[PDB]
């Protein structure tokens, strides 16, 4: 395939009901945004926009949205498991890394800066793996006295700065992972990463099914940019898919239940076709479908 | 010890923030219930009462309070693990049963009827274990059989104990279980005289509150509800975390209990129910401020 694949991830019960809440919150704003169509007022746009934002955060981790109860330290032994237990995306990642760590490889991961970076690091501390950041920050200053075949490099999707922090790697990235949808693989800094020695490193994007993640990714290759049609299809989908949020299809489940061993072949020959189906398409929902969806809320 | 022990259980992140929400919901009602003390209006009482109820449900499982996303089928292979992953109480139970299932034993479990029963059954399907209910309902070679009884009236004449052996242990899932009642006293004495009681309790949760103040104010006293509500609200921050001492036992998947499982006469290996402070109208205010 295209060297640009998706890796669907589930959603914890908490992640689901969080999203469900986020939607209930913008309930009226949603109906508005779809009623007076095209006219569209700025307040309402910002509402749709931030409802989308908060949905995106929760999709990769609840802590990105709610500090409450976040461990004061992310270093303690138990944290990695706890983080994974609360974000299907993190759980998939961890599963993934449990495989790639066996190999001698440098693997790149791009995600939005800030708390996402920290949580990403914290999650990775549960893996037999070297960790390099490129923002001069970290939660473990100290370096691994250990000997790991696999090193994981954590890059910001929003500007890197390779002159103060260069790639001391001395080897190609065998794979680049998109954690958020904040990642624009077209940008130069990310294009630099992919070509670090075929010409391009495989991209694999972690996406929660039927989540905002799914919406942004699919409509993105069909309406682009900040079109009215993008936001309309994306918001309508997020809201309507809210019920099937983050459940893998029956076909796909065993692969994930099997802790993703299904991917070993492709991991060893990154030239072989991506073993998983292409990003499932999403319907273009109508102002009608959103109303019908939001009703089952109303009593 | 007394043949009546507690088994603390943790709380999932979701169970925590749910409780936290439940509290925020009754925020004003709480301040009211503590301000105009003793006077107490009926609406507010019902508020305190149901805030307590909803907290209790969440403590044993979030699905008891929010249908949203509950699998339409509880039989599929993955359900047991999913349920446990979302209630520290269920996770402890499963851990427990993973031990007791190795033995030739009949183990009794009492919990509130209804969805609790179903979820209990679903959770148990992940265990090498026979399951008997006594409500004629259900959603579906083992040494271990687990008997699920309602805490709220049983009916042993339409559904008798075909067991033919003593219950080596009786487990309280909810706080809905009154071991003093006759039907439960019948169960404990089914062949020493009484089966050991072990009660699953989420630390610093309403569960903890009800159980401890219960042996200190009883019944539906003003002082019970006052100490219980104040505690639930204030402990909200330390909700469902085991003390450093206790953690390894649980991390070790509870093997620490094997000795007691084999000789139910040995003293309960875990500390007695940790006491809770009697909090003041003052402490609840300070707690709710933040």
Query: Which DSSP string corresponds to B122-145?
Result: HHHTTSS-EEEESSS------SEE
**R_g (Cα) of chain A, nearest Å:** 19
Instruction: Supply B6's token pair.
Output: 């507690």
Nearest residue to B173 (alpha-carbon basis) of B102, B114, B258, B234: B114
Query: Min CA distance, B13 vs chain A (Å)?
Result: 7
Bridge partners of A106, per DSSP, are A151, A173
Nearest residue to A61 (alpha-carbon basis) of A116, A110, A131, A125: A116
DSSP assignment of chain A, as one string? --SEEEEEE---HHHHHHHHHHHHHTHHHHHHHHHSTTT--HHHHHHHHHHHHHHHHHHH-GGGT--TT--S-S-STTHHHHHHTT-HHHHHHHHHHHHHTTSSEEEEEEE-STHHHHHHHHHHTTSSSEEEESSS--S--S---S--SEEEEEEESS---TTTS--TT-S-EEEEEE-SS---TTSHHHHHHH-----SPPEEEEEETTSHHHHHHHHTTTT-TT-HHHHHHHHHHHHHHTTTTT---TTTHHHHHTTTGGGHHHHH-TTSPPSSPP--------HHHHHHHHHTT--
For B82, B87, B95, B187, B260, the CA distances from B143, given in Å and listed in that order, are 25, 27, 17, 20, 18
- CB-CB: which of A20, A69, A253 is closest to B17? A69
Rounded to 5°, angle at Cα B80 from B78 and B83? 105
Bridge partners of B8, per DSSP, are B201
φ, ψ for residue B197 (rounded to 5)? -100, 130
CA distance A19 to B197: 41
Nearest residue to A123 (alpha-carbon basis) of A206, A238, A213: A206
CB atoms within 10 A of CB B39: 7
A–B: how many Cβ contacts below 8 A?
A: 34
Q: Where are the domains of chain B?
A: 1-290
The set of residues, in sequence order, having a beta carbon less than 8 Å from that of A263 and lying 6+ positions away, is A96, A99, A255, A275
For A130, A197, A203, the CA distances from A169, given in Å and listed in that order, are 12, 12, 19
**CA B150: distance to chain centroid?**
13
Length of chain A: 299
- CB-CB: which of B13, B62, B85 is closest to A69? B13
Residues of chain A with Cβ-Cβ distance to B62 below 8 Å are 13
Suggest the residue from A14, A16, A71 to mutate for an interface test with chain B (most B CBs closer than 10 A): A14
Class of domain B1-290 (CATH, top level): alpha beta
Residues of chain B with Cβ-Cβ distance to A14 below 8 Å are 12-14, 17
CA distance A144 to B22: 43
B13–A257 CB contact, under 8 Å: no
* Residue in chain B nearest A245 by alpha carbon: B69
- Host H or E run for residue B4: strand B4-9
- Host H or E run for residue B109: strand B105-111
Rounded to 5°, angle at Cα B275 from B93 and B100? 20
The set of residues, in sequence order, having a beta carbon less than 8 Å from that of A299 and lying 6+ positions away, is none
Experimental determination approach used: X-ray
Q: Name the residue with tokens 């440098």.
A: A106
Is beta strand B105-111 parallel, antiparallel or unpaired with respect to B144-150?
parallel
Nearest residue to B190 (alpha-carbon basis) of B173, B172, B166: B166
CB A180 within 8 A of CB A191: no
CATH 3.20.20.10 fits A1-299, yes or no: no
Suggest the residue from B69, B79, B90, B236 to mutate for an interface test with chain A (most A CBs closer than 10 A): B69
- CB-CB: which of B14, B78, B82 is closest to A14? B14
Rounded to 5°, angle at Cα B162 from B161 and B166? 65
CA distance A1 to B62: 42
Is beta strand A173-178 parallel, antiparallel or unpaired with respect to B105-111?
unpaired
For A55, A225, B252, the CA distances from A246, given in Å and listed in that order, are 12, 25, 31
CB atoms within 10 A of CB A76: 12
Nearest residue to A100 (alpha-carbon basis) of A89, A109, A87: A109
CA distance B254 to B100: 11
Instruction: Supply A215's token pair.
Output: 């919406």
Rounded to 5°, angle at Cα A185 from A57 and A120? 40
CA distance A31 to A46: 14
Query: Min CA distance, B16 vs chain A (Å)?
Result: 8
For A97, A151, A262, A265, A274, the CA distances from A271, given in Å and listed in that order, are 19, 21, 16, 10, 9
B68–A16 CB contact, under 8 Å: yes
Bridge partners of B53, per DSSP, are none
Half-sphere CA count of B104, side-chain side, radius 13 A: 3
| Resolution at which this structure was determined, Å | 3.0
* Residue in chain B nearest A63 by alpha carbon: B13
Which positions in chain B have a beta carbon within 8 angstroms of at least one beta carbon in chain A? Answer: 12-14, 16-17, 20, 62, 66, 68-69, 78, 82, 85-86
Nearest residue to B49 (alpha-carbon basis) of B208, B275, B178, B228: B228
* Residue in chain B nearest A18 by alpha carbon: B14
Query: Min CA distance, A225 vs chain B (Å)?
Result: 33
Burial (Cβ within 10 Å: 0-12, 13-18, ≥19) of residue B54:
buried
The answer to whether the Cα torsion of A64, A69, A73, A75 is positive or negative is negative
Suggest the residue from A16, A21, A64, A69 to mutate for an interface test with chain B (most B CBs closer than 10 A): A69
CA distance A133 to B34: 51
Longest dimension (CA), chain A: 62
CB atoms within 10 A of CB A208: 27
CA distance A287 to B282: 51
φ, ψ for residue A83 (rounded to 5)? -60, -45
Determine the straight-line distance between the first and last CA of chain A, rounded to whole angstroms. 48
């Amino acid at each position: 395939t295209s060297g640009d694949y998706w890796l669907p991830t589930t959603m914890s019960l908490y992640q689901k009901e969080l999203t469900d809440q986020i939607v209930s919150l913008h309930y009226s704003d949603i109906l508005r945004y779809f009623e007076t169509s095209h006219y569209k007022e700025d307040v309402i746009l910002e509402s749709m926009k931030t409802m989308c934002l908060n949905g995106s955060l929760v999709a990769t981790h609840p802590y990105l949205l709610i500090d409450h109860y976040m461990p004061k330290s992310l270093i303690t032994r138990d944290v990695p498991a706890h983080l994974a237990e609360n974000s299907g995306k993190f759980s998939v990642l961890r599963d993934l890394i449990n495989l790639v760590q066996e190999y001698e490889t440098e693997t790149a991961i791009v995600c939005r800066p800030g708390r996402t970076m920290d949580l990403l690091e914290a999650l990775l501390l549960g893996n037999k793996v070297h960790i390099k950041r490129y923002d001069g920050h970290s939660i473990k200053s100290a370096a691994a006295a250990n000997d790991f075949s696999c090193t994981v490099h954590l890059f910001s999707s929003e500007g890197i700065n390779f002159t103060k922090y260069p790639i001391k790697s001395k080897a190609r990235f065998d794979m680049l992972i998109c954690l958020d949808t904040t990642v624009d693989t077209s940008q130069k800094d990310i294009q630099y990463l992919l070509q670090y020695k075929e010409r391009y490193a495989p991209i694999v994007r972690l996406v929660a099914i039927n989540s905002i993640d799914h919406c942004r990714l699919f409509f993105g290759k069909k309406f682009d940019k900040n079109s009215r049609e993008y936001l309309e299809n994306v918001t309508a989908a997020m809201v309507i898919l809210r019920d099937r949020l983050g459940t893998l299809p029956p076909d796909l489940r065993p692969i994930y239940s099997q802790k993703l061993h299904y991917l070993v072949e492709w991991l060893e020959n990154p030239t072989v076709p991506w073993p998983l189906p292409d990003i499932y398409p999403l319907k273009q929902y109508t102002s009608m479908d959103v109303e019908r969806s939001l009703l089952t809320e109303v009593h």
